[PDB]
Amino acid sequence: EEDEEVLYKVRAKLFRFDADAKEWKERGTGDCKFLKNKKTNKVRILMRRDKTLKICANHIIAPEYTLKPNVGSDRSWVYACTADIAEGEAEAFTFAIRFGSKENADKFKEEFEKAQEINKK
Amino acid sequence: SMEGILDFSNDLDIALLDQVVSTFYQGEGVQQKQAQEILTKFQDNPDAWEKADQILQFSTNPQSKFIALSILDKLITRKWKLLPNDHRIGIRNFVVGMIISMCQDDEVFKTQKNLINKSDLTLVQILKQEWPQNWPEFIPELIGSSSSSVNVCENNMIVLKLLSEEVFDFSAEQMTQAKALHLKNSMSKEFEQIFKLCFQVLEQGSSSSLIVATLESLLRYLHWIPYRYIYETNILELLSTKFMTSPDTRAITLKCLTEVSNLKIPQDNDLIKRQTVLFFQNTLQQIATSVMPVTADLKATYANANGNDQSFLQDLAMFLTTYLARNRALLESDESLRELLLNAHQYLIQLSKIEERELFKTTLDYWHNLVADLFYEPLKKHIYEEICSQLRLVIIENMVRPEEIQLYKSEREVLVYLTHLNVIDTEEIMISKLARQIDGSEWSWHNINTLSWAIGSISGTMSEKTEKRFVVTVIKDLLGLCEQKRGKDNKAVVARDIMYVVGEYPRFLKAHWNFLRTVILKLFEFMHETHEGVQDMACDTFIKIVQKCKYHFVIQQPRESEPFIQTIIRDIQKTTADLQPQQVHTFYKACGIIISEERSVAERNRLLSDLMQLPNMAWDTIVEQSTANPTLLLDSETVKIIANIIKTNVAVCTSMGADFYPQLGHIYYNMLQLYRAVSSMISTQVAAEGLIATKTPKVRGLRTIKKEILKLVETYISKARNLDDVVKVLVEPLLNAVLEDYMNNVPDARDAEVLNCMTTVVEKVGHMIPQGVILILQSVFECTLDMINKDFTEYPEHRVEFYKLLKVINEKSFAAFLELPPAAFKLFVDAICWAFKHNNRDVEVNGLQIALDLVKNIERMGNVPFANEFHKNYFFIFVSETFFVLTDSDHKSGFSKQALLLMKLISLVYDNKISVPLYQEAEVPQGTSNQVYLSQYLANMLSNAFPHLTSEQIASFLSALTKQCKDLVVFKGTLRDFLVQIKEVGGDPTDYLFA
Amino acid sequence: VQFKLVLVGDGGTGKTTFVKRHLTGEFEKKYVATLGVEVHPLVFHTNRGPIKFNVWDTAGLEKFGGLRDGYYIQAQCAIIMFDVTSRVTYKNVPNWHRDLVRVCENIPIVLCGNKVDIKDRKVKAKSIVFHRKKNLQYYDISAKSNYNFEKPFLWLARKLIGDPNLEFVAMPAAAPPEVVMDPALAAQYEHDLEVAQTTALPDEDDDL
Ligand SMILES: Nc1nc2c(ncn2[C@@H]2O[C@H](COP(=O)(O)OP(=O)(O)OP(=O)(O)O)[C@@H](O)[C@H]2O)c(=O)[nH]1
């Protein structure tokens, strides 16, 4: 992560939807980071777990992505991710990310849009 | 093809078994998984034991042989006594032959320790069944066979160690009391011969593996053998010299010497005292010459973790702490043992510096024992001056935060004792550690925090005068440190530590009002600092100072115009303006503590009125608008304001209790109307949006209002003093507002907090509102039961609160159950037995308590129809449900209470407290006493549930158990013997005669 | 570099829950009793390179015990688990320890008191002394709050690699691919998203 600028850092819990069990499954808790590649100017979400530092999210903030509310939460977003490489081979996921407060979640949405617009260039 | 081993119609293919096992142990993913299921089914086949001798002879894979011995172990432990004598002798000879054979082949002995140890354990399982009564020559033959080979001699020490563990260490749960006593006496009788063999090997043994296996068995023997085998032979000297010098034997030897230190020993014998001293002297001399000197840096060594160093240092800590806790007084009175005493302690000082929390705790328990003795024992402290000085530094440098409750407690108590023994040395070490924070040499957040916790821990140990000079020096120093530090992170850390220390020295604060005021005013300034942790620390320090100094806020101090509580309240809006809601509540909670100090009723009510001014005005304006327009509640932001008003009421009620009543009176009627309004909105939202509505922030916000209203009322009623007012003013409107709302909501909208509130009401005023208890039962009983009577997992909060409610109704207002119709009373008895089958221990315990209390309640009624009908309907259901949970193995945490309940039920019949016959007519002779019939019913019930038991076993069990219906510990013993016998075939019925 | 780790302890102590949290990051709330053993590879990235645990998560319930000590053969390390909210589970620690060491005499073993997140703790700190004379490491853990959840593995890794300064490190993070959402599966994604938005996130009261 030495070739990337940190645009935004926030504590978050990340979930992935399991369509089979029809339930949200925690994927990790830790620092969610918007990283700007200094060669391509491409902004990714990289999220690592507390203590193990294992990757629970690694994907481009695609301009097509849309943050939607969850019915249960005023401090979360759900969005479809076409290609996440946290577990290795790129996979499609339905993700949910929850923050400490409505304020953190709105701030995240603001940064995620600013990142989408950097990724349009 | 792997599944071929499961087909027993054909003879077993050993090569196929060896592939499955290989695939299981060395395979991966799908293959490993399928091999696992197959091996499990093979092993669990009740005829698989017949294949064991075939597998042991013809298998190449030692893993296969391991699994074969597990199959044999299942047969030996469970069904051995069904086998003909000749077949048992066959298996015995086969197993002994496989052991001796594997030992005689040097390559197998060396490389197959797994299989040999499993074989030895299999043999010990045969000895538990057969020895000595059906195998008197076992020990003579073992002793004989030991001189034939070093491998067999070594392996025989493994058999004897396992035999000792099985008979003395692990027998309590796994054998009947009679069988355990028999095997203990049997080993005791043959021990003189076993010891001779162990002593010979130790005296003349040349092989390290043999010597270690012998010392491993000795460690097991020391748990039970008499002291004379250690003290009246050469063995103490061999342990404390020869075996400490070689590092093969040193760890096992240190563990033996720890156990030697615990032997039961005569107290009045100078020769034994000298031997106890001598083995300690020998062991410490071998450590100092062969391992490390007293000066060695054990922290560094442990950290490096070379080979077995960490285990050896842990074993050394255990040996020194165990011997010294028992024997240091032997070393204290004689000048020639002074150096040995202080060397042993100096090693403990060096062990106490190791960075290993669990080792530190072991040494801290010893230091606590020592410094407590120095605090009380005459003419002892002067011996340990230099040990104590070093220990002060080790404790101060290792102080943890008070949130780590047990460790902080132990460390505080050690440091308090040490501070008493030499206050000057403690003060100097703390001041000089503070100087190394100020000069930067040792500066870090962790270090200034650690020092602050240490300084705080010793509050109250110094004289008021010494304390004053000390506190001033520390605050002066921490303030200098504050000014000197750059950036708000460093300043926040030092500020937090100042607040921490100040909060731990209330005696200083109470004698220095001018300082206390400055502290409070500074805490108020810090409540405007949004820098993380500062507001939370300011609020925590405020309430902590208030709890301790509250009287100083309620009196007019000389040179003040008013009591400081009035000054706090007047400026409360401005003080609290930048706090998060939970910090505001803590602040109001702290003011409530102060106001409760004012015992003039008129002045207290006035302060309470002034304190509640802001939430009462916000409340009043909300109610004006809320009453004018019902729709205003829908607004997310109003819901948050309402909930925070109620939470402020809860916070003040929490500290004021009975004194809160006038404030509860001011809001009570509109609060219950708000409860109903909020309830309609939740009902409206669930209808319009579905069950999903209950997950929405809007509905969770409304539910929060209902839960905080219930929490406020339970908080007041649990501390209320005027119960007449509770019954006359609060209870009727509460029941009207909550009971029907609970009953007429869908299960997912029902608040378990209603049950919790109702429990507090019945607890406090249940005796004064018999019709109110009936109404509670009728509203919540059948509908809550229907939420929780489908599985053990749905609605866990309701499940817990439901049984707490039935428990308290059954204690305080048992009349409400008499008012239930018979069908509803049956559901109640069903509900109790349901609680018994719960794996949830909150439910199960309430279940068993309700059952106990219900018996007592029915017993109290005496000889009337309700009692008689209850026994005829439910006595045998309770007896059999209790036997079911005692025997099924899924409810072992309830064992004690299940036994108590069974004893009480059985004893009712013995004490003739059941008037009607429990048997229906023509089932038995019409004269027959309930006492005789109980035994007949129990024999029949046990016979069906446990058909492998003989009639003799059940009758002997029941004869013992019934006679012990007054003696709970003996009763429990009989039950435990029965739980052993039901796991096997052919249990001895004379076991129930144990005494 | 892979090591066989055996996880033993009473039913319902949190063995499967702890491993799953480590495997996927999820907290399984439901109790589905393990049948015999579940084997899962678990990899950590260290300053000394990747370490792999072949985790043998064994059944705690006697009735689902399967091969029992059969699972312990060639274990290089072990975790004994109890539940600090259930006294019987601590009472049983010596029984699991016994069965384990009879098969694996000289292996590093961590004793773990799980469920320290629960306020009503039944096995107090003062009571937990079994590890001392058996040279077990001990940690309070919570699979639910993640309190000390990395400690059992970091300790075992230090013992198995024979490096006391071994640290978990951040796995280097490959640049994620740019892809365009397929017009054919565009309709499909809208459906899956609708279901996920109308299912509530668990534990909405938690700090995250
Ligand atoms: N509060 C709390 N619950 C926990 C914690 N860890 C696990 N649990 C729960 O406790 C239960 C433990 O289930 P498992 O992890 O399957 O138990 P196990 O030890 O694998 O049991 P067996 O497979 O039968 O040996 C589940 O309901 C878990 O969600 C914890 O740290 N805190």
Ligand SMILES: *[C@H]1C(=O)c2c(O)cccc2C(=O)[C@@H]1C
């Ligand atoms: C067993 C044994 O092997 C042995 C050695 O090694 C040396 C001296 C005596 C003996 C015995 O006879 C032991 C019983």
Ligand SMILES: *[C@H]1C(=O)c2c(O)cccc2C(=O)[C@@H]1C
């Ligand atoms: C910093 C500081 O913390 C402080 C407190 O906490 C109270 C009174 C005065 C001060 C300072 O001036 C220190 C620089």
Ligand SMILES: *[C@H]1C(=O)c2c(O)cccc2C(=O)[C@@H]1C
């Ligand atoms: C008490 C007891 O319950 C009992 C029953 O129930 C049957 C026969 C004998 C007894 C006793 O002797 C016990 C004292």
Ligand SMILES: [Cl-]
């Ligand atoms: Cl004895």
Ligand SMILES: [Cl-]
């Ligand atoms: Cl003593």
Ligand SMILES: [Cl-]
């Ligand atoms: Cl006072």
Ligand SMILES: [Mg+2]
């Ligand atoms: Mg499991």
